[PDB]
RNA sequence: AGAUGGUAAGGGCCCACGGUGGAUGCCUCGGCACCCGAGCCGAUGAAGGACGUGGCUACCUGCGAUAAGCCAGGGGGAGCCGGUAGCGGGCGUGGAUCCCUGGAUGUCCGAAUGGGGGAACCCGGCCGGCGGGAACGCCGGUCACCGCGCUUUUUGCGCGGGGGGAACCUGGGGAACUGAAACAUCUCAGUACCCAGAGGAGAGGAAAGAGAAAUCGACUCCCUGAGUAGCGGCGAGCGAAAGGGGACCAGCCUAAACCGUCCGGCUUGUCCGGGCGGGGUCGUGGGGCCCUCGGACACCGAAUCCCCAGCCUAGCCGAAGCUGUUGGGAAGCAGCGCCAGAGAGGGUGAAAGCCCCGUAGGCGAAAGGUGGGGGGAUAGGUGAGGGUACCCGAGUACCCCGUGGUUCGUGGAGCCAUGGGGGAAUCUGGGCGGACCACCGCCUAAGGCUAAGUACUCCGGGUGACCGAUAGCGCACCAGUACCGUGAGGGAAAGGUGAAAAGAACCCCGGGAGGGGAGUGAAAUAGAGCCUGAAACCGUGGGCUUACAAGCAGUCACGGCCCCGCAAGGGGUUGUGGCGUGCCUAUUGAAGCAUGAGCCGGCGACUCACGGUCGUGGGCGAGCUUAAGCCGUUGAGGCGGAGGCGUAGGGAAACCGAG
């Protein structure tokens, strides 16, 4: 509980470091470690694979998780905090001064 | 906590208004049999002390 | 000590006896503006005593 | 004939570099302390356990054969199938996972309770079901004991009890060391411990009180009274009360006389007794019965019950920034802005009010727990005068013998309690006011209940001139564990890679281990019990040095050799000469053949509380100062003269007083 945070799975900007300013859709969000997967931080893994099954695994430089605080949501206007407004029924969330 | 006044000493010694201690003359109750009228009279009056005066002060302090 | 302290700060010439308070409500902007015209640029710590 | 460089099997000193080892620094989920909140659980089976449960499960956690969980009501709004990745297979906006409330299931042990028992095992009776099911086995329900009321009897029916709890609480028992510089009375102490009981508290409690005021007015706790009164082998020591000031505030039911009634007993009566109802509850004495009053409408009003506010048990909203600049990484530096009832704190690759979480401020409950805070109802309760003299708590008061409590140790020894013996009275009664008498005066025993103020902290929260892994709880880490004991019981060590695992693919030596490349990284003497890495201790390389030498190992001088500097000079080494009895403790005296220390590193010893005494800084000064506590605050101060020290001493005291 309360583990919830900023954004979810959608468009997001990154003001981190090695990939500052960059932008991309957040494909994953692990709340336990409080970090999300985007398209910025991507490091090369040399390991063949931990599991013997499927001989080749990949020297892949896949996406590495990223602290969910360095990433910020976005809309028509670039980079905005998050306000919330209970709809005429539900509970949607509006940006700095616009909808959704 | 709270120094207890030495009752054994108060019942037998009163301090002067100044700072001196006074008590009755010793030897006058038992040894008696037929001593010179001087002795018995000399023993009638109280007296001052010296160093141990300070000692007995440190008892009747709250008093 | 209390009076002496007050008398000290006053002797230096800092004990101001205000009364006018354009600060209608609990809004910092108002005070910051009131203090600005009060001669309080913020370059000095102050003990704002008031009821 | 003479003279004097070289030589190192090894050793020494110094310098560089590594190994070992884990000090120091910094870090902190943990711990400590205080404050506030909250406070019982159990035969509807508790506390605490055993066994079992995941597709693959060793342990922890969760759960209980429906066994990482099932049903429903809320909360929440994208992810989820615990720590836990991987093989393998799924769930989620038709709103899951998670959190809060209720419910269901809940093996076997355990108060354990059908019986037995070496706890988690073994064996049954009664009813009903299952398998062909009479022998066998399984499943559901049920059967322990004790207490009280019902049951006329027997047997049954119902209600309760049992056990657990860190500390606190009451009652029944109850030490010794130690102090007294011995010891025996005393002290330690009614403490430790044992035992039974009670619940968020317990106890105590509406005067047979206190004690001298022709006064106060239950009880409990805090100031004070006071180290006073007293106690005491008058030794060591022990140690009240009244009164004043505060918190809190609360007062009630019954026994008896007397009336009705039901039951059974007999010596049959106008009665004895038991059960129930009415009546009655007092110390200006009260009540009963009869008479008179008009004696009814109101007046009092719960501690019990009903509704509600509020509160705990999940949560939600929530102001304000963007580009440059150095870097592995901005939040640092710069430039130009903004919010603030929010500039507390935490995180984000480093140093952030405006990035994330928050904070100020303000929202929220279907359900469950609390709730006189507010309101409502019910119980119960309210008067006068005269007469009558009926009643007012029994092996009790009272007295004596033995004793405990109290400040009271037999003291002149009362009072409160009571093991033994004797043993009354009912207001012309009876206790007490410190032996006794008298007078004056307080109070109504021998029946019970009563909130609050008070104590404690297993549990939750907040805070800290509290610790920071040899500290802090014994335990920051799967610790009451490993290990040690037959058993009570004893009881450790052990934390840190990095911003991210990007945890080093692939080649080479090798059996492996471990290395050398390469690669990741800002960093690899950050490379895996891996941050910082001190010291003892081990080792290689280099400078100087030593095989005719005698010693607390050093110091003083000269010289040679090696190294830094423009020079003079400074550093390392030691050839020769001079001089020289280690440290500590204990002692009249130690180099001592007196004690202690193998070496390094870390933990380790004059504190605090209250009271006293002198000095001292500072405020006030015949005055000075407040204590509990109330108000305020949320790291604010203020009020509060009850009380204490001082202004007069002297005497044993009556008393007198600059004497
Ligand atoms: Mg004479
Ligand atoms: Mg005094
Ligand atoms: Mg080397
Ligand atoms: Mg259980
Ligand atoms: Mg299995
Ligand atoms: Mg698992
Ligand atoms: Mg019958
Ligand atoms: Mg002894
Ligand atoms: Mg002895
Ligand atoms: Mg005693
Ligand atoms: Mg009580
Ligand atoms: Mg109090
Ligand atoms: Mg007291
Ligand atoms: Mg004592
Ligand atoms: Mg009655
Ligand atoms: Mg009545
Ligand atoms: Mg006595
Ligand atoms: Mg008796
Ligand atoms: Mg009574
Ligand atoms: Mg009570
Ligand atoms: Mg510290
Ligand atoms: Mg053994
Ligand atoms: Mg390093
Ligand atoms: Mg030299
Ligand atoms: Mg020694
Ligand atoms: Mg000797
Ligand atoms: Mg000496
Ligand atoms: Mg020696
Ligand atoms: Mg010796
Ligand atoms: Mg030795
Ligand atoms: Mg002192």
Q: Specify burial of residue B63 (Cβ count, 10 A radius: 0-12, 13-18, 19+).
A: exposed
Q: A30 C-alpha to center of ligand 9: Å? A: 78
What is the distance between the alpha carbons of residues A4 and A6, in angstroms, rounded to a whole number? 7
**Of A58, A22, A59, A56, nearest to A38 (Cα)?**
A22
What is the distance between the alpha carbons of residues B32 and C1, in angstroms, rounded to a whole number? 69
What is the distance between the alpha carbons of residues B63 and B7, in angstroms, rounded to a whole number? 10
Contact A63, A36 (CB under 8 A): no
Q: Specify burial of residue A94 (Cβ count, 10 A radius: 0-12, 13-18, 19+).
A: middle
What's C33-47 look like in SS3?
HHHHHHCCCCCCCCC
Using the Cα atoms of residue B57, residue B58, residue B59 and residue B62 in order, give the sign of their dihedral: positive
**Resolution given for this structure, in angstroms:** 3.6
Distance B11 CA to D177 C1' (A): 34
**Of A46, A68, A66, nearest to A57 (Cα)?**
A46
Distance A74 CA to D582 C1' (A): 81
Q: Nucleotides of chain D within 7 Å of a protein C-beta?
A: 75-80, 83, 85-88, 93, 95, 98-99, 226-228, 230-232, 234-239, 314-323, 327-330, 339-342, 347-349, 354-358, 499-506, 519-521, 609-613, 638, 648-652
What is the distance between the alpha carbons of residues C9 and C49, in angstroms, rounded to a whole number? 14
What is the distance between the alpha carbons of residues A62 and A43, in angstroms, rounded to a whole number? 6
Using the Cα atoms of residue A16, residue A19, residue A22 and residue A26 in order, give the sign of their dihedral: negative
Q: Which chains touch C (3 or more CB pairs under 8 A)?
A: none
Backbone angles phi, psi at A72, to 5 degrees: -130, 140
Q: How far is CA B61 from CA B1, B57, B58, in A?
A: 14, 6, 6
What is the distance between the alpha carbons of residues B44 and B24, in angstroms, rounded to a whole number? 7
Largest CA distance in chain A: 56
Residues 6+ apart with CB under 8 A from C14: none
**β-bridge pairing B14-15 and B21-22:** antiparallel
SS3 call for A72: strand
What is the distance between the alpha carbons of residues B2 and B11, in angstroms, rounded to a whole number? 20
Using the Cα atoms of residue B32, residue B34, residue B39 and residue B44 in order, give the sign of their dihedral: positive
Q: Which two tokens stand for residue A60?
A: 């892949």
**H-helix or E-strand containing B41?**
helix B37-42
Distance B18 CA to D486 C1' (A): 76
What is the distance between the alpha carbons of residues C33 and B44, in angstroms, rounded to a whole number? 92
DSSP annotation string for C1-51: -HHHHHHHHHHTT-----------SS-HHHHHHHHHHHT--SSS-------
Distance B11 CA to D613 C1' (A): 23
């Amino acid at each position: 509980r309360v583990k919830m945070h900023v954004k979810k799975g959608d468009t997001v900007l990154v003001a981190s470091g090695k990939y500052k300013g960059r932008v991309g859709k957040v494909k994953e969000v692990l709340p336990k470690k409080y970090a999300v997967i985007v398209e910025g931080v991507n490091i090369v893994k040399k390991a063949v694979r931990v599991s013997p099954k499927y001989p080749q695994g990949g020297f892949i430089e896949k996406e590495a998780p990223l602290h969910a605080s360095k990433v910020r949501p976005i809309c028509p206007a670039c980079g905005k905090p998050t306000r919330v407004r209970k709809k005429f029924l539900e509970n949607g969330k509006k940006i700095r001064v616009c909808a959704k | 906590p709270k120094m207890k006044t030495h009752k054994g000493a108060k019942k037998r010694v009163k301090i002067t208004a100044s700072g001196k201690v006074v008590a009755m003359k010793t030897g006058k109750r038992h040894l008696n049999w037929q001593k010179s009228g001087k002795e018995i009279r000399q023993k009638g009056r109280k007296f001052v002390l010296a160093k141990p005066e300070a000692e007995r002060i440190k008892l009747l302090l709250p008093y | 000590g209390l009076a002496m302290a007050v008398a000290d700060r006053a002797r230096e010439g800092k004990l101001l006896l205000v009364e006018a308070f354009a600060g209608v409500n609990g809004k910092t902007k108002e005070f910051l503006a009131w203090a600005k015209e009060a001669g309080l640029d913020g370059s000095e710590s102050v003990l704002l005593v008031t009821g």
